[PDB]
Design a protein around this ligand. Structure first.
Ligand SMILES: *[C@@H]1O[C@H](CO)[C@@H](O[C@H]2O[C@H](CO)[C@@H](O)[C@H](O)[C@H]2NC(C)=O)[C@H](O)[C@H]1NC(C)=O
Ligand SMILES: *[C@@H]1O[C@H](CO)[C@@H](O[C@H]2O[C@H](CO)[C@@H](O)[C@H](O)[C@H]2NC(C)=O)[C@H](O)[C@H]1NC(C)=O
Ligand SMILES: *[C@@H]1O[C@H](CO)[C@@H](O[C@H]2O[C@H](CO)[C@@H](O)[C@H](O)[C@H]2NC(C)=O)[C@H](O)[C@H]1NC(C)=O
Ligand SMILES: *[C@@H]1O[C@H](CO)[C@@H](O[C@H]2O[C@H](CO)[C@@H](O)[C@H](O)[C@H]2NC(C)=O)[C@H](O)[C@H]1NC(C)=O
Ligand code: 7UZ
Ligand code: 7UZ
Lengths: 413, 413
């Protein structure tokens, strides 16, 4: 029914024992790949709650970021020892499968330790890992399945979904992507606008960008070869990403301060926790495996990106009208800004277009605007107002509320 | 030397007695106007520290907002009883004169209770009130004088400064305006851009605005008579100001929740405190005066606005090269957004233009980018990153640091 050998018995750092069962073990990917999973059953009706895959991006970064710092049942504290229960955990209402992927990420590995990979191989290996999951957990074969993820998983998830839709044994019902990479061109073009209108660039640089990169109403900040345009865009890149601003949340401090872990981020708490030998033992991690890192340098170094846009994947997925799709963006993220993804969804040109509206969450404090939703048939784009790249870290209530409406095919408003 | 009759002896709600002397009384304005002031001496070297006038805007709102909730020596707590010392108080380094203005605002009054006024009369009455201040505090006649204020005081302060510059007995050294109204046209045009690029408007409305309000690279969202443009701008106005977003800070909650005190604000703590009869007694407020309100409805109702731009005032002030000028803007404010004021300063076309740079504040956490500065001869424009309309409330350390560099004519970086 379920793999007892993978069950987590007593997790260090928890002051109270979980109400739900949880598992940590390995799913077989392609070739000699073994992907480490951490599966947390629904706090309410695990038997009949949906199964929800969560992937973080990178490429080369760990989905345990998602668990321990974003939307897991408990979150790691700054001491790197203590875990506290998360009242906005996505596993309140779902069986959440966190998958460290591809091979070499975190506790994932391969027998030959060859971790050079690409989008197509990653998709196929994740597909095989999911098949393995259902072999290990056959009681979950008929549950509604959602595929979800963040940023670079904007590529992982639609490409995986395209494989999954071809497998009728999998009860695929939808996908959700947070601050996802959907189109390099829409992301790059929108970012330049974002930088100016958020006060990061001045008039002089904006006038120059407009003169050199744009023709009439249309700007090309993506693959323009205009000489001064390129120079200006190099300066924009410097300001946005190389000057002490936090690219993941414009209004957050840069961890470690302005320069003389990707810049401005600090993953020490998760790393401290996960590298505890007793935590590794509780997580059923083989002793022979190397130290845990949030991101694998070699995986990212050798990663070959293949897709420049997910337009074809989303159109394929929408064609069947079987799946509900959500793209959601913290609107203070600069790594994958909200506007590029809003442009992306609009450009899919789907039917039953709805007027753009605010969506609401009840705080104390009463009802507040949590962001805006633009909906079409089978697909919605949503902002999360005041959240950066890691939406559930920044606005955990709004994130949970959105996730609940998504899972239940309820209006986002 | 100083008016002992106006000195505040023991202020209710303070757990420790102030290190500095403070006064509350009346300055004579024009006609039968009596403007209530609260003057707080520098915590360090009051004798030789600058004198700094602070005005809040409205028109019709109280500068005691500035004291009790923004940058005063102590701030009112949610109980509306307790005052706590402010470690980032502007009176750490300056003698700060908070002036309730014009007549009818807060504890200010006139013998005939006729409060209909206009920009020119307000400027002349404030000028006479300052003359009265120096008659009452002749020991401060030679101190460096700065005139400062917020939002609508973007009109109050440059118009007053123009009067003050003609009075050689006043040691005028500079002016600073926070989220100031400097040009209706630059504010209105920039706001529409701000709304779109902060995710408040969608593609459909943006495309329409561009088609109907704009010609080539130039948009007119100020006095355009294009029919569909006007309709679109009515929808923008609704979204920005009439839909449950906090216009003063886009990422803050709306006090009292989304609709079925100006909307989204809550002034109950200051009002509770100030309406305490014992606080009124300590502040030397005549018992006959009506209840204290943050803003006077009648003053605002009957107020006649006369200036549509401060361009001429700032050019007059810059012409002498005697005064240092600062315009600073919280960059998440929508009431007087940063970009309109940056456009405003740039359009003054001053000499010794400096490249736009980040400016820094030391937190724990190390050095962080606090915003960006665009400087010219005798005038700088600065953003405060992540602050709304009330900059010192939202980012008190950054505000104090900026204020200190301003007062001392130090680089903003
Ligand atoms: C990165 O995060 C780590 C872990 O959260 C921080 O380390 C410390 O944080 C607190 C402040 O001293 C202490 O209470 C913790 O005990 C301590 N945690 C650990 C595991 O050492 C660290 O300060 C952060 N670094 C930066 C520059 O932000
Ligand atoms: C993505 O990676 C896969 C797997 O390494 C590549 O697929 C092929 O690569 C090998 C080297 O040429 C072949 O020997 C394998 O048979 C073949 N594997 C499969 C299952 O197709 C693929 O070429 C890579 N894609 C790109 C564009 O680099
Ligand atoms: C407006 O502000 C007032 C005063 O700060 C709030 O009133 C209360 O706030 C706290 C929560 O109940 C209490 O601890 C205070 O005692 C109480 N203060 C006073 C003076 O009554 C009030 O909740 C606010 N209103 C809204 C809708 O935000
Ligand atoms: C602004 O207000 C002032 C004062 O009320 C106006 O100034 C004049 O108004 C009165 C009515 O006409 C005259 O009788 C006063 O003598 C005169 N006061 C002074 C000192 O000039 C002024 O007209 C108003 N400005 C506008 C445009 O309405
Ligand atoms: O958000 C993600 O999943 C990563 C970045 C994230 C990985 C874990 C550590 C923090 C950065 C991406 O942008 O692809
Ligand atoms: O910021 C100000 O001074 C006012 C608004 C403010 C007055 C006091 C109460 C809060 C709003 C303005 O915008 O002119």
């Amino acid at each position: 029914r379920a793999p007892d050998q993978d069950e987590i018995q007593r997790l260090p750092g928890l002051a109270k024992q979980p109400s739900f069962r949880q598992y940590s073990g390995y799913l077989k990917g392609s070739g000699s790949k073994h992907l480490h999973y951490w599966f947390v059953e629904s706090q309410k009706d695990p038997e009949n709650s949906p199964v929800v895959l969560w992937l973080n991006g990178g490429p080369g970064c760990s989905s345990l970021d998602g668990l321990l710092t974003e939307h897991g049942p408990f979150l790691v504290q700054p001491d790197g020892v203590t875990l506290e229960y998360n009242p906005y955990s996505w596993n309140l209402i779902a069986n959440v499968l966190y998958l460290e992927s591809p091979a070499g990420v975190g506790f994932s590995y391969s027998d030959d330790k060859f971790y050079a990979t690409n989008d197509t191989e990653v998709a196929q290996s994740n597909f095989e890992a999911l098949q393995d999951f259902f072999r290990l957990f056959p009681e979950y074969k008929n549950n509604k399945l959602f595929l979800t993820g963040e940023s670079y998983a904007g590529i992982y998830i639609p490409t995986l979904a395209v494989l999954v839709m071809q497998d009728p044994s999998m009860n695929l019902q939808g996908l959700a992507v947070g601050n996802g990479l959907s189109s390099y061109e829409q992301n790059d073009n929108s970012l330049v606008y974002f930088a100016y209108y958020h006060g990061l660039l001045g008039n002089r640089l904006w006038s120059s960008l407009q003169t050199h990169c744009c023709s009439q109403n249309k700007c090309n900040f993506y693959d323009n070869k205009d000489l001064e345009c390129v120079t200006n865009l190099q300066e924009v890149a410097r300001i946005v990403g190389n000057s002490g601003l936090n690219i993941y949340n414009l209004y957050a401090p840069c961890a470690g301060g302005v320069p003389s872990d990707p810049p401005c981020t600090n993953t020490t708490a998760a790393s401290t926790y996960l590298n505890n030998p007793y935590v590794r033992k509780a997580l059923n991690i083989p002793e022979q495996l190397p130290q845990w890192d949030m991101c694998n340098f070699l995986v990212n170094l050798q990663y070959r990106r293949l897709y420049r846009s997910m337009n074809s994947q989303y159109l394929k997925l929408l064609s069947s009208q079987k799946y509900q799709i959500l793209l959601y963006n913290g609107d203070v993220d600069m790594a994958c800004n909200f506007m590029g993804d809003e442009w992306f969804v609009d450009s899919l040109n789907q039917k039953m277009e709805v007027q753009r509206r605010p969506w609401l969450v009840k705080y104390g404090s009463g009802e507040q605007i949590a962001g805006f939703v633009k909906e079409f048939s089978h697909i919605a784009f949503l902002t999360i107002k005041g959240a950066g790249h890691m939406v559930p870290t920044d606005k955990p209530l709004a994130a949970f509320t959105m996730f609940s409406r998504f899972l239940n095919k309820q209006p986002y408003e």
